[PDB]
């Protein structure tokens, strides 16, 4: 019907996917063996979206795990859900990129991209009518950001009319995890601008703050951050797996949101995030959903609204709720805050209501928002890159691997004109 082939490139992509498939299998009643023990018949009607059929009534995901070094996939395999993947889908090589975009894009990814292209051609053509692909990766690394965009470049030419989503993890303003991270960021953004229809910007300490303040967890883990990203990635595609009073797939969210084919970088958000001790201090209604949805402390990016203007906002609801309440909340949130929404678009909120919440919750919501204030991510990345590149700070680890300075120059100029275009649509009559 409408199937999604899920790609995960790099250590960040593999560790995100290892939790994404766990939360999806718990949502669809799939055990670690791979069988089905669902309590309702609605959990298997649309199991062909993510799961392929096997002999003996077994369900395997449409996952392609890509890594330059097989090190992270021992931890992926040894986990609780590591044995549900088909072993032919694991693609790996001999050496790693070592946080080098150039190595994983030119020298080490050029011979590993063929096997991945074969496995995605085999997986994509076992489908009835493919809707689109899906990539999870990070922009600061070398394999997930170098190979992760070569994959999109090769896939887009073969499938030019499908959906390419990228749940990317963007670099961090306060402290980093990679010294050469601005180079990888500016190189990967230049590919992500042309080659994707939807891109999700996810910041790490946005997740850290969310866990420490809105969840009030004393000691988190990267597993909790991956759970947040998995929950905000499952709720986007929840209207094409369950029925509802208003349906919206990936293409309906893409058409309603991007007004121009460049402004496709968004802000995720998950609204029912209760505290560890403050569950009894709330009366769960739709106004609290909207209030925690639009609170600027609840975004998944370190860049904020109230410095820019919302262009389009998505709101995918889950649960049995009334539609007058949802509609009046979205009317109030635009009317009462009339300066952070653009004036040339009369309605900036697209709403979708499904029927089945996540298991254990009564209602749910998933913010997706196109803001003109995403550009301070790109502005800061450009400032860090113009600090590093002008003095050839680490360029010899790239130019000796068959790169050229012109490629960094394209990668910077494209982001700078994207910043200029966001500024032009920031203020307009």
């Amino acid at each position: 019907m409408r199937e999604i082939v899920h790609l995960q490139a790099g250590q960040c992509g593999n560790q995100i996917g290892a939790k994404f498939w766990e939360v999806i299998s718990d949502e669809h009643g799939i055990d670690p063996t791979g069988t089905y023990h669902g309590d309702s018949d609605l959990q298997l009607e649309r199991i062909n979206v993510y799961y392929n059929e096997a002999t003996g009534g077994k369900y395997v995901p449409r996952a392609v795990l890509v890594d330059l070094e097989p090190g992270t996939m021992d931890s992926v395999r040894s986990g609780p859900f590591g044995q549900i993947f088909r072993p032919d889908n694991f693609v790996f090589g001999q050496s790693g990129a070592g946080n080098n975009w150039a190595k994983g894009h030119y020298t080490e990814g050029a011979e590993l991209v063929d096997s991945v292209l074969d496995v995605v051609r085999k997986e994509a053509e076992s489908c009835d009518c493919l809707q689109g692909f899906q990539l999870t990766h990070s922009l600061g690394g070398g394999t997930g950001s170098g190979m992760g965009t070569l994959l999109i470049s090769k896939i887009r030419e073969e499938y030019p009319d499908r959906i390419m989503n990228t749940f990317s993890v963007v670099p961090s303003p306060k402290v980093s995890d990679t010294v050469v991270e601005p180079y990888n960021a500016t190189l990967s953004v230049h590919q992500l601008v042309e080659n994707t229809d939807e891109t999700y910007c996810i910041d790490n300490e946005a997740l850290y703050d969310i866990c420490f303040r809105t969840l009030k967890l004393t000691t988190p883990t990267y597993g909790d951050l991956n759970h947040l990203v998995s929950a905000t990635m499952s709720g986007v595609t929840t209207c094409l797996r369950f029925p509802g009073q208003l349906n919206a797939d990936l293409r309906k969210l893409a058409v309603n949101m991007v007004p121009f084919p460049r402004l496709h970088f968004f802000m995720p958000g998950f609204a029912p995030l209760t505290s560890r001790g403050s569950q009894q201090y709330r009366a769960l209604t739709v106004p609290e959903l909207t209030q925690q949805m639009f609170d600027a402390k609840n975004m998944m990016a370190a860049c904020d609204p109230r410095h820019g203007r919302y262009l389009t906002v998505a709101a995918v609801f889950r649960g049995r709720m009334s539609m007058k309440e949802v509609d009046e909340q979205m009317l109030n949130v635009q009317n009462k805050n009339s300066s952070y929404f653009v004036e040339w678009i009369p309605n900036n909120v697209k709403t979708a209501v499904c029927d089945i919440p996540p298991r254990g919750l009564k209602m749910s919501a998933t913010f997706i928002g196109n803001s003109t204030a995403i550009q301070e991510l790109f502005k800061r990345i450009s400032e860090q890159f113009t600090a590093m590149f002008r003095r050839k700070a680490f360029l010899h680890w790239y130019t000796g691997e068959g790169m050229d300075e012109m490629e960094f120059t394209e990668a910077e100029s494209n982001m700078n004109d994207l910043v200029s275009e966001y500024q032009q649509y920031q203020d307009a009559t």
């Binding site: 074969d118 051609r121 085999k122 053509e125």
Partner: peptide, 28 residues
């Protein structure tokens, strides 16, 4: 362009290269 009995050939829209050549009808 495809190559033969590969997954890129049985595709909604593909071009498949033919067999290379033969030996006769040309001088040795």
């Amino acid at each position: 362009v495809s190559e033969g009995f590969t997954v890129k050939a049985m595709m909604k829209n593909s071009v498949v290269r033919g067999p290379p050549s033969a030996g006769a009808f040309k001088e040795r």
